[PDB]
Amino acid sequence: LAPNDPYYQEYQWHLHNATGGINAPSAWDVSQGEGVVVAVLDTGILPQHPDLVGNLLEGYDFISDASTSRRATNDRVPGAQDYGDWVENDNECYTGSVAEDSSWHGTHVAGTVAEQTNNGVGMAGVAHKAKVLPVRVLGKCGGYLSDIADAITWASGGTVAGVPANANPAEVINMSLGGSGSCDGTYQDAINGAISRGTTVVVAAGNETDNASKYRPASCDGVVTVGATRITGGITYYSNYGSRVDLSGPGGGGSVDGNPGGYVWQSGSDAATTPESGSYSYMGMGGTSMASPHVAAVAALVQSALIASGKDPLAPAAMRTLLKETARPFPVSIPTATPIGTGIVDAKAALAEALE
Ligand SMILES: *[B]([O])([O])[C]([C][C]([C])[C])[N]C(=O)[C]([C]C1=[C][C]=[C][C]=[C]1)[N]C(=O)C1=[C]N=[C][C]=N1
Ligand SMILES: [Ca+2]
């Protein structure tokens, strides 16, 4: 499938480039992810983005701190509206931090997963007939482990005290988020719960040019840890590495690769603070954050295709095995001391092997 989205051909190398893309055009002849739900645990979403409307569920906001959520109370509430995670001053978050505009990171990531495709608008997405379940866990200066842990539980169909039962348990969780430290019991237990319910958990390796073993949830057991490659098919300057990294997806090499080649392109906003301070747009972002949702979406394509053939969905361990075994070996040599898994996720190869 060559979809008709106006910016797809020029911008979205990460979908269709022969060295650095995930073989999406061929995959899309087989599956678009229909009937699957991917939970995006992130900064929230702009739910009326014209290129997302139709592929989103209401979701929920798990941030239990008014200052972080920019909401009026510390309550968790239905919906996942991103209120903006901007920070006006240097050093507000940690000693050393610098002021940043609102990321709309969750809307970008959600676009990689399920941006409306072949609709003659904006950009394409990978699992563009799936639904995204947005689960807002990050706000101003980030979020809290307890919020993220309960979000994992709820997203995967587990019970959380204080939140109504999830009517849309997700086959796949994407966490384009993390921080320093080995995986603790809190993360690991929530993740083990999701896995026990059949949910595959896909996470960003991190962007510290460091061993993924030193970060969480990257270093958690049972997860798919995703490094980042360039348009060239080689390691990005920022990607974390190590034996824990399972495979890579396109994350974008940044300025060395230019515009558009250095960035992944999806739905977002130019708003600097509140949603109202800007308008809907398409944004180019780089990171393991962008790589992870390509892999989460491919998982969704696989689960969907199987259901369509009346076959059983893959258990998490099988999904991770399939993603690794079917990845495209890197077209550029990866240095021995910075491994980033078995290859670049290959949407077509994954589908072909699952349907054999
Ligand atoms: B990514 O953008 O590549 C990245 C991956 C992560 C595993 C290191 N995600 C983040 O940095 C997320 C989302 C984000 C929010 C705002 C600006 C840019 C990105 N954030 C976090 O995980 C986070 C944020 N603040 C504190 C701690 N962690
Ligand atoms: Ca589109």
Residue numbers in the entry: 1 to 356
Give the article text.
Through the COVID-19 pandemic it gained more prominence by being a key pathogen in respiratory co-infections. This study will present a structural analysis of StmPr1, S. maltophilia’s main virulence factor, an excreted serine protease. StmPr1 is a member of the subtilases family defined by Siezen & Leunissen et al.. It shows the main structural and functional elements of the family, such as a reactive triad consisting of Asp42, His105, and Ser28922. The catalytic triad consisting of Asp42, His105, and Ser289 is located on top of β1 (Asp42), α4 (His105), and α10 (Ser289).
Bortezomib is a proteasome inhibitor, using a boronic acid residue to reversibly bind at the active serine of serine proteases. Accommodating the low solubility of ammonium sulfate in dimethyl sulfoxide, the solvent for Bortezomib, we adjusted the crystallization condition. Instead of 1.8 M ammonium sulfate, 0.1 M Tris, and a pH of 8, we used 0.9 M ammonium sulfate, 0.4 M lithium sulfate, and 0.1 M sodium citrate at pH 6. Despite the changed conditions the resulting crystals show the same cell constants and diffracted to a similar resolution. Additionally, Bortezomib is stabilized at its position by Ser176 forming a H-bond to the nitrogen of the phenylalanine part of Bortezomib. The oxygen of the peptide bond between pyrazinoic acid and phenylalanine connects via H-bond to Gly178. Moreover, three water molecules stabilize Bortezomib through H-bonds with the nitrogen of the pyrazinoic acid and oxygen of the peptide bond connecting phenylalanine and borono-leucine. For Bortezomib the P1 site is occupied by the methyl group of borono-leucine. The phenylalanine is located in the P2 site, while the pyrazinoic acid occupies P3. Therefore, Bortezomib is a solid inhibitor for StmPr1 using the combination of the pseudo-peptide structure with the strong binding capacity of boronic acid to block the catalytic triad by binding the active serine covalently, while the bond is supported by His105.
